[PDB]
A paper describes a structure:
In the mature virion, the portal–tail complex is present at a unique vertex inside the DNA-filled capsid. The portal has a canonical 12-fold structure that is formed by 12 copies of the 725-residue portal protein gp1 arranged around a central tunnel. Further local reconstruction of the portal by applying 12-fold symmetry yielded the structure of the portal at a resolution of 3.2 Å, which was identical to those previously reported structures of the portal in the P22 mature virion including a lower resolution helical barrel structure, flexible tunnel loop, N-terminal, and top regions in the wing (residues 1–5, 422–442, and 480–487, respectively). The tail structure, attached to the portal through interactions with 12 copies of the adaptor protein gp4, was also identical to previously reported P22 tail structures. The C-terminal helical barrel domain (residues 601–725) appeared unstructured. Structural comparison of the procapsid and mature virion portals revealed major differences in the following domains: (1) the top region of the wing domain, which interacted with the SP complex (described below); (2) the stem and clip domains, which likely interacted with the terminase complex motor during DNA packaging; and (3) the helical barrel domain, which was absent in the procapsid. Pressure from the packaged DNA induces conformational changes in the capsid and portal proteins, triggering the dissociation of the terminase complex and the attachment of the tail machinery to retain the packaged DNA.
Tailed double-stranded DNA (dsDNA) bacteriophages and their eukaryotic counterparts, such as herpesviruses, possess a dodecameric portal at a unique vertex of the capsid; this portal serves as a channel for DNA packaging during viral assembly and delivery. The portal interacts with multiple copies of a scaffolding protein (SP) to form a nucleation complex, which initiates the assembly of the major capsid protein (i.e., coat protein) and other minor proteins into a procapsid. The P22 procapsid consists of an icosahedral coat comprising 415 coat protein (gene product [gp] 5) subunits, a dodecameric ring comprising portal protein (gp1) subunits located at a unique capsid vertex, and an internal core comprising approximately 250–300 SP (gp8) subunits and 3 ejection proteins. In this study, we present the structure of the SP gp8 in complex with the dodecameric portal in the P22 procapsid at subnanometer resolution.
Residue numbers in the entry:
A (entry chain O): 2 to 148
B (entry chain T): 6 to 154
C (entry chain Y): 2 to 150
D (entry chain r): 1 to 153
E (entry chain f): 3 to 472
F (entry chain a): 3 to 68
G (entry chain a): 406 to 472
The structure:
Amino acid sequence: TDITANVVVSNPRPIFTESRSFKAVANGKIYIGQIDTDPVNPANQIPVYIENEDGSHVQITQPLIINAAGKIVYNGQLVKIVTVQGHSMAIYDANGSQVDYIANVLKYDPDQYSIEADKKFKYSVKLSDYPTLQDAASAAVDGLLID
Amino acid sequence: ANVVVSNPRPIFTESRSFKAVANGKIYIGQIDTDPVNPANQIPVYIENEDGSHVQITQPLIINAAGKIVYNGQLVKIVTVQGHSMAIYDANGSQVDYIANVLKYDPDQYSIEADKKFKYSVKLSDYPTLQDAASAAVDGLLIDRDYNFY
Amino acid sequence: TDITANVVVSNPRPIFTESRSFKAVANGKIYIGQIDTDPVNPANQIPVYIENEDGSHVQITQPLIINAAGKIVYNGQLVKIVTVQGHSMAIYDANGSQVDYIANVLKYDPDQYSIEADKKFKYSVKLSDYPTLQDAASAAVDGLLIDRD
Amino acid sequence: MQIKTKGDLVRAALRKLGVASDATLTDVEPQSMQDAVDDLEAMMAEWYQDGKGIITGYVFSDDENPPAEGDDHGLRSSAVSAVFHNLACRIAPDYALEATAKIIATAKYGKELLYKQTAISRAKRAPYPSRMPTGSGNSFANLNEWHYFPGEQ
Amino acid sequence: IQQLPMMKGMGKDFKNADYIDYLPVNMLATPKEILNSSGYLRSFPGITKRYDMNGVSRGVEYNTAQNAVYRVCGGKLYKGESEVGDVAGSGRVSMAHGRTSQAVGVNGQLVEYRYDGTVKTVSNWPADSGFTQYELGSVRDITRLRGRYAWSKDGTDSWFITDLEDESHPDRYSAQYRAESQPDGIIGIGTWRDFIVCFGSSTIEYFSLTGATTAGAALYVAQPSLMVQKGIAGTYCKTPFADSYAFISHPATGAPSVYIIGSGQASPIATASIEKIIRSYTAEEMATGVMETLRFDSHELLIIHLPRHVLVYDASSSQNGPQWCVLKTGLYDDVYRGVDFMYEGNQITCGDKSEAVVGQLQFDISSQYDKQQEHLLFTPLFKADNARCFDLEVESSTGVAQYADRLFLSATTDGINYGREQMIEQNEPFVYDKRVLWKRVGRIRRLIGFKLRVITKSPVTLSGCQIRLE
Amino acid sequence: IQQLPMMKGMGKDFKNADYIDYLPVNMLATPKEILNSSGYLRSFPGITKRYDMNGVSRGVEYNTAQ
Amino acid sequence: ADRLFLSATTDGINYGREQMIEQNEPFVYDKRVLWKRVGRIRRLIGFKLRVITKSPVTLSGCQIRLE
């Protein structure tokens, strides 16, 4: 049959690996800054927030640690480290050697489409969904429709 | 010139080392629950390139590379509801646990949104005006400058 | 809660690995083509651009070259590749075999309900949730609704 | 050891030659890496001579696995300092470069150290000839009717 | 050991594969006979806010009768910091001071202000007086020779004159003059050494006054020995530069290009790549291009404010070929900020084009207002095969910074797109002696060219790039 | 290693055995101080149709008044 | 990928065989255009560089290893 498709199984954690080889950055640092600037100096850095399992954000210091696997570690493995706007990443290696520097990066967060949909669309409860008119008007907000 | 070219295939690795989780098992269970016990899981479905769907047993198998494999070929797995996934190694250890792959539940929220939003469609998404009006209800927008003929 | 925070910090350079084993594909060609077509045939290919620092997009030959690190490489140096979304992908081994073939990369998206939901509704920004008027006006498409704050 | 893979050997050779490293602005195209690793495989095949020649821990790639750069090499830690030096000496004619005398001396030293242990282990003395009597002092092999040595056989 | 010049860098464009050179972005060139090279490259001075005014700059002129700088600067006129009057109209205006009135000339009428405090407008003599009663029209540009003004009618060969005793009426008897070798409108008017230079669409003609001592008999007679035979592209594409005007050619001739007037002919000063940039604009867009002249230290600049380019010509540094430069504000491509430069007192006061503010140039800071700026330098393409470059050492002068700013360098193999960007610090706040170099650059296959991006808000000086080729 | 100029080429004609140089057809000459030589040769620009008119061209003049 | 025809004269009037070398590729910004063997020249030689395209043609600097 052809059932509706909603979500696909995927790995939600990113891995940072060495350039010119297939090794993982052991305990390097990732600096987040503005578009064409140098992320190292404090002036060019932008706020960075953790995204917990439940919707919440905790701000942390800009230099981000990496564990052996190549995933950002913090204390235990940290979730999605969502920032705002388009940043520039300057990944360093353990002994302060520059692995890669990139100017413009922008990747949107795929989770929590419910909030965006609530903030986006227009409310119209219609009439076909509800049996009677009074209960429909009870749950109607800023609009109503007839059969 | 919008999206960066990238590999969309899922690769599953260890948390404390650079390994491929050889011969691991992935369990797709119910939302915000423990998926190991057979009590609370949801059906999983293969989605071929053409679009067919096939039922699949709960213990999804991981190849030596770290990619999900069924029979002898790589596959793409799709579930209808929101799910919580737990990846285990060959020896039975836990690699990672995700309570919510997506924070919301697609099915119940889909029903609620169908109830509480206007069913109007736009022209931009649909190439031709007739095709747009065929599947449009309660309104239409005429977004782009459609050519007459 | 604290802020919108719509941008995730992730790997900015894609990694292509083997299917049967766990090693980066070395000197493996990549072909990009239209939806549900074979990118090997040059008639089905679409333009591929390198985005330099200046923002100028420069087109290059279709077969992209991977290095020993698993990343797309041009003349020995790493580059950022941007193309129009909706491209089939075919990754080929150096020997000439086929590693992976993806008919439509937009299908390998964790949330697919969003694609269907975006089509069948109109967008209306409410002044209630946004703090100030300018913020609501900037992100406003197709009318607004005037509420408190 | 940080030089686990064959690609690490190739990159070490290139760095020693000065062509390219991690701190260089221009880099080498992957087909040249493929050619260099093929040359490494050919050179290692020529020293083994199929068990008769220099013996070192080395595994030749299978072809069932596509990338020969990624798979690990069974080289012991002592042989690494010789193998990539010899590889860098051999790659020099591929470019217009010529190896510095220090690299040549290091390659000589490395090959000598590779073969010295096998040379010690293979220096064995042949048994007694067939027509060689055993004297009357053994008193046991002489009393067991086995008067003469068996032979090389 | 080889030395790489960076005053101008060659390259190619991906659109049609032609060799076009990359001008140094936002950095000037000065020949000074430095330690081991001949000349050093220094960043442009930074802007700092001085006063707050009504709107974006629209005109400027240094009044000589009163030692002060006049500028409309948007909605309403300003003298230095004081207001002294109101002006009407939006756009760009042409100013020409006088010894009794200022004169702004907005819209199509010669509005002239008075030092007394009144405003007057040029109009025909009253019919009751009994004078010749000309037919005036719309005005484009204004000038002043001796004790009288001079303006040009819009779209017509005629340019009028101003009476002596009353400077608000055309004249008593003789004020109608015309250009007229060839049928062409007077795009602009100007004065040069007692000659009223009339800039036509296709020709340039010189008028010299003669002693009339008669009622209405040819006060000005056209001199035909000094005709140039080339026009000007737009109304404001003219400046006093050196002893000539240095216009921009009109589309009526073969192609637009920068020039300089000689004795009786125009000598080009624009390289082919500059004319390629000029041709990128349509005819209508080019007509809105402003030109100026600025001189500080030994420099002599000629700045062209095209809609998307701020090309700058340095006359003193052009020992061997023209030396063009381009300025930009943002980290990405953007038009420069600051329209009108004028020397007031002992400082330079720059205008603005996107904010209602005026600012002054400062030499010890390289930031416009309080935002960092980008500086670029390009090395021309070299063809060396199988070589290996190791010690690329540029020579900077440091010690006037606020933070240890870093430098980005990269290399091209094809001359279009660049490789990885390496970060090297090139300045330290209070260290006067330091080395800026990179120890390994690696093999070059066919050809290579370098880049020296710097992002700072402190003065940047680089002089002499040398690489050990083998 | 010798460098061969291409801006103009010498030759001879078979009619009277005189030395006549061969002009480079359909490509221009530009001096620009290229990587290793001084000058590069670029082809003439190509024509593309813009308007359809009555017939063969017979005159042209850029009116300055309009 | 347009091709280039080159040929040589011994007497300066009539040309020899035409050799075909590609001189342009649609989206390759770095490539070499060269011929590896030209052979002995008896008394004198001159060359020719026929190109037939509908794309811009740029050539700058022809060099030969004389011995």
